[PDB]
Amino acid sequence: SNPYERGPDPTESSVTASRGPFATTTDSVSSLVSGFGGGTIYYPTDTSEGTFGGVVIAPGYTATQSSIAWMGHRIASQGFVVFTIDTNTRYDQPDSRGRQILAALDYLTQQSPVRDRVDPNRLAVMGHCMGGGGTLRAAENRPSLKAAIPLAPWHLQKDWSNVRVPTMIIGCENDTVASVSTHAIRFYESLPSSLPKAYLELRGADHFAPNRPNTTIAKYVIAWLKRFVDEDERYEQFLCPPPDTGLFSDFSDYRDSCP
Description:
The chain contains six helices and nine strands, in the order αβββαβαβαββαβαβ. The protein is an alpha/beta fold.
């Protein structure tokens, strides 16, 4: 038995939906909170199935939470507590984002209005651009985390062989800000070979593809969160077998660790 399973058995239809089975609302967190620059918490209103996994998502350089908010209701409604932060300033570098992600996690589980709805043992980190570099760092530093999902990441450190948290890196094929050959793929290729991982490269997408609703991104994000945060093997169908990487797919490349 698995007590962390939430919601009905998933179909192609459910993973690609813009709103999953759970109704959601939001709490605001002011910038005067310490360790970061505030943000919005998206969470399910139904308590009857149990507590949910927690997820912090962080933006990129020069950007705010507006650039990631689409992920809030989208992911929370599949059965998660999702925290979209702002960083102290818009110009904080990756490792600083990393500190701040870690701080928003602690705030979510220890002090927020919705702490009583979050399982403090089941957490994940995601981010975009430098926020994704920060995501890598957070996972390097807090190996108790269940999942890490860097979107179009940027970081000067290329070697992430010390990461031990299941990691799905999502690259954008035509990224000229954080080109996949000097960022995303270098990171993926350095991950230990024993570690559950995946690299998704979106065909013909630019660097900002993560900042607007994207059905492909949402499906594999929801699946990776589900599989490792909730331990839920009902979502392994969407991860293995891997999908196709022809010119007739949304993916220009896909690497994995299957079975």
